[PDB]
Amino acid sequence: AFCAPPAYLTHQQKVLRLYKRALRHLESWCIHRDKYRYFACLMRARFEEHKNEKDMMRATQLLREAEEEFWQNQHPQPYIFPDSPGGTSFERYECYKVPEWCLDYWHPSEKAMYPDYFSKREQWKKLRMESWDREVKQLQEETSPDGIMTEALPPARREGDLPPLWWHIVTRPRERPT
Amino acid sequence: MLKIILPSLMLLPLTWLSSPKKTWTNVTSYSFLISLTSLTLLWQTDENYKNFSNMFSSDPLSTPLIILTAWLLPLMLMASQNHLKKDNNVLQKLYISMLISLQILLIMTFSATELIMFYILFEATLIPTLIIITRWGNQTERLNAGIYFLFYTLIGSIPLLIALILIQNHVGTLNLMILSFTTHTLDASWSNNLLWLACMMAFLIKMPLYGVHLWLPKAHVEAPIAGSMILAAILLKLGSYGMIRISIILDPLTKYMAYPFILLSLWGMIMTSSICLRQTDLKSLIAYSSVSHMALVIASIMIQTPWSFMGATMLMIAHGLTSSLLFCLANSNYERIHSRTMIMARGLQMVFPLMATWWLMASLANLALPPSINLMGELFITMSLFSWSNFTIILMGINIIITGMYSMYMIITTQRGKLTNHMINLQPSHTRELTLMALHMIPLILLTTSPKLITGLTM
Amino acid sequence: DSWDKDVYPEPPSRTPAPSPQTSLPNPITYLTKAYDLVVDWPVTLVREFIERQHAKNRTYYYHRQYRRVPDITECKEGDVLCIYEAEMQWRRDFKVDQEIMNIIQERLKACQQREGENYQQNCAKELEQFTKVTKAYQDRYLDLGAYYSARKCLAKQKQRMLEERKAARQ
Amino acid sequence: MNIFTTSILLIFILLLSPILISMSNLIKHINFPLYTTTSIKFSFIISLLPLLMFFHNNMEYMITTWHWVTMNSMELKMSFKTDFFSILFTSVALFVTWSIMQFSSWYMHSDPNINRFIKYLTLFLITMLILTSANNMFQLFIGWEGVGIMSFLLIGWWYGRTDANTAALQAILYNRIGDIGFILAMVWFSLNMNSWELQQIMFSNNNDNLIPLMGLLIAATGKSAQFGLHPWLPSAMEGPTPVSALLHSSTMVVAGIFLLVRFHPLTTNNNFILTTMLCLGALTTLFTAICALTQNDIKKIIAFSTSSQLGLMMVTLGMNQPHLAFLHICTHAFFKAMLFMCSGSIIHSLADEQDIRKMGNITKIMPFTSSCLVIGSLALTGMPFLTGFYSKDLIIEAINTCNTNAWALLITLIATSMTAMYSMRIIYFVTMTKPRFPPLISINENDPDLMNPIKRLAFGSIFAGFVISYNIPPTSIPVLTMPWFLKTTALIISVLGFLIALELNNLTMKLSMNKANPYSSFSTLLGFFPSIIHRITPMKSLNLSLKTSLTLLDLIWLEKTIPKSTSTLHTNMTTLTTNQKGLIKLYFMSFLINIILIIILYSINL
Amino acid sequence: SGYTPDEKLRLQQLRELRRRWLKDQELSPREPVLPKNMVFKAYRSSLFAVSHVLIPMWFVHYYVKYHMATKPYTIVSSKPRIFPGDTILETGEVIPPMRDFPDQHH
Ligand SMILES: CCCCCCCCCCCCCCCCCC(=O)OC[C@H](COP(=O)([O-])OCC[N+](C)(C)C)OC(=O)CCCCCCCCCCCCCCCCC
Ligand SMILES: CCCCCCCCCCCCCCCCCC(=O)OC[C@H](COP(=O)(O)OCCN)OC(=O)CCCCCCCCCCCCCCCCC
Ligand SMILES: CCCCCCCCCCCCCCCCCC(=O)OC[C@H](COP(=O)(O)OCCN)OC(=O)CCCCCCCCCCCCCCCCC
Interacting residues of D488 by C-beta distance below 8 A, sequence separation 6+ = none
User: Which residues in chain A have their CB less than 8 angstroms from residue D359's CB?
Assistant: none
CA angle E34, E36, E38 (to 5 degrees): 130
CA distance D44 to D67: 27
Residues forming a β-bridge with D197: D136
Q: Which residue's CA lies nearest to atom 42 of ligand 1?
A: B159
Q: What is the CA radius of gyration of chain C?
A: 26
CA distance D545 to B401: 14
Method used to solve the structure = cryo-EM
Nearest CA-CA distance, residue A28 and chain D, Å: 7
Interacting residues of B207 by C-beta distance below 8 A, sequence separation 6+ = B236, B239, B240, B243, B294, B295, B297, B298
Sheet containing D61-71: give its strands across.
D74-82, D61-71, E75-77
The ligand placed nearest to the CA atom of residue D407 is 2
Q: Which residue's CA lies nearest to atom 45 of ligand 1?
A: B159
CA distance E102 to D476: 26
CA distances for E56 relative to B332, D7, D13, D19, E41, angstroms: 42, 11, 7, 15, 21
Please list the alpha-helical segments (H only) found in D108-240. Answer: 114-133, 137-155, 162-193, 198-203, 210-224, 232-235
Distance B65 CA to ligand 2 centre (A): 40
Q: Do C31 and D46 contact (CB within 8 A), yes or no?
A: no
CA distance D146 to E85: 49
Experimental resolution (Å): 2.9
CA distances for D160 relative to A88, A102, A157, D336, angstroms: 13, 18, 38, 28
Q: Which residue's CA lies nearest to atom 16 of ligand 2?
A: D534
Let me know if B81 is exposed, middle or buried by CB neighbors in 10 A (0-12, 13-18, 19+): buried
CA distance B411 to B362: 10
Nearest CA-CA distance, residue A77 and chain D, Å: 7
3-state secondary structure A19-71: HHHHHHHHHHHHCCHHHHHHHHHHHHHHHHHCCCCCCCHHHHHHHHHHHHHHH
CA distance A152 to A167: 16
The ligand placed nearest to the CA atom of residue D559 is 3
CA distance D582 to D22: 82
Q: Do D420 and D308 contact (CB within 8 A), yes or no?
A: no
Q: Do B33 and B11 contact (CB within 8 A), yes or no?
A: no
Q: Do E75 and D79 contact (CB within 8 A), yes or no?
A: no
User: Which residues in chain D have their CB less than 8 angstroms from residue B393's CB?
Assistant: 183-184, 187
CA distance D67 to D77: 4
CA distance B405 to D537: 13
Q: Do D435 and D365 contact (CB within 8 A), yes or no?
A: yes
CA distance B273 to A159: 61
Ligand 1 pocket test: pick from D559, D566, D569, D570 the residue with the most ligand atoms within 8 Å of its Cβ: D566
CA distance B88 to B95: 11
Q: Do B194 and B260 contact (CB within 8 A), yes or no?
A: no
Helix or strand run (H / E) with residue B97: helix B89-111
Q: Please state whether the peptide bond connecting residue D265 to the residue before it is cis, i.e. omega within 30 degrees of 0.
A: no
Let me know if B419 is exposed, middle or buried by CB neighbors in 10 A (0-12, 13-18, 19+): buried
User: Which residues in chain A have their CB less than 8 angstroms from residue E14's CB?
Assistant: 163, 166, 169-170
**Among D469, D455, D476, D286, residue whose Cα is nearest residue D371:** D455
CA distance B74 to B381: 31
CA distance C152 to A162: 89
The ligand placed nearest to the CA atom of residue B150 is 3
CA distance B414 to B355: 11
Distance C132 CA to ligand 1 centre (A): 49
Phi, psi for residue E104 in degrees, rounded to 5: -135, 45
Ligand 1 pocket test: pick from B153, B194, B205 the residue with the most ligand atoms within 8 Å of its Cβ: B194
CA distance B6 to D57: 67
3-state secondary structure E21-55: HHHHCCCCCCCCCCCCCCCHHHHHHHHHHHHHHHH
CA distance D87 to D50: 7
DSSP string for C57-88 = T-----------PPPGGGSPTT-HHHHHHHHH
Domain count across chain B? 1
Q: Do D318 and D404 contact (CB within 8 A), yes or no?
A: yes
Q: Do B297 and B323 contact (CB within 8 A), yes or no?
A: no
CB contact E23 to A (< 8 Å): no
DSSP string for A93-152 = GGGT---GGGGTS--HHHHHH-HHHHHHHHHHHHHHHHHHHHHHHHHHHHS-SSS---S-
Phi, psi for residue D577 in degrees, rounded to 5: -85, -25
Q: Do C80 and B178 touch (CB under 8 A)?
A: yes
CA distance D77 to D198: 13
The chains in contact with chain C, meaning 3 or more Cβ pairs closer than 8 Å, are B, D, E
User: Which residues in chain E have their CB less than 8 angstroms from residue A115's CB?
Assistant: 33
> Which amino acid appears at position D357 of this protein?
R
The DSSP letter of residue E68 is I
Domain limits for position B95: 2-459
Q: What is the CA radius of gyration of chain D?
A: 31
**Among D457, D252, D258, residue whose Cα is nearest residue D342:** D457
Region of residue C114 (phi > 0: left; psi between -120 and 50: alpha; otherwise: beta): alpha
Q: Do D201 and D236 contact (CB within 8 A), yes or no?
A: no
> Which amino acid appears at position D319 of this protein?
M
Distance B212 CA to ligand 3 centre (A): 12
Q: Do B306 and D72 touch (CB under 8 A)?
A: yes
CA distance D216 to D5: 29
- Note the residue count of chain B: 459
Let me know if D392 is exposed, middle or buried by CB neighbors in 10 A (0-12, 13-18, 19+): buried
CA distance A161 to D21: 54
Distance B196 CA to ligand 1 centre (A): 9
Q: Which residue's CA lies nearest to atom 24 of ligand 1?
A: B191
Q: Do A74 and A25 contact (CB within 8 A), yes or no?
A: yes
Interacting residues of D279 by C-beta distance below 8 A, sequence separation 6+ = D318, D405, D408
Let me know if B18 is exposed, middle or buried by CB neighbors in 10 A (0-12, 13-18, 19+): middle
Interacting residues of C51 by C-beta distance below 8 A, sequence separation 6+ = none
Restricting to B residues 302-321, those with a Cβ less than 8 Å away from any Cβ of C are: 304-306, 308-309
Interaxial angle between packed helices C27-35 and D3-22, expressed in degrees from 0 to 180 and rounded to the nearest 10:
70
CA distance D527 to D522: 5
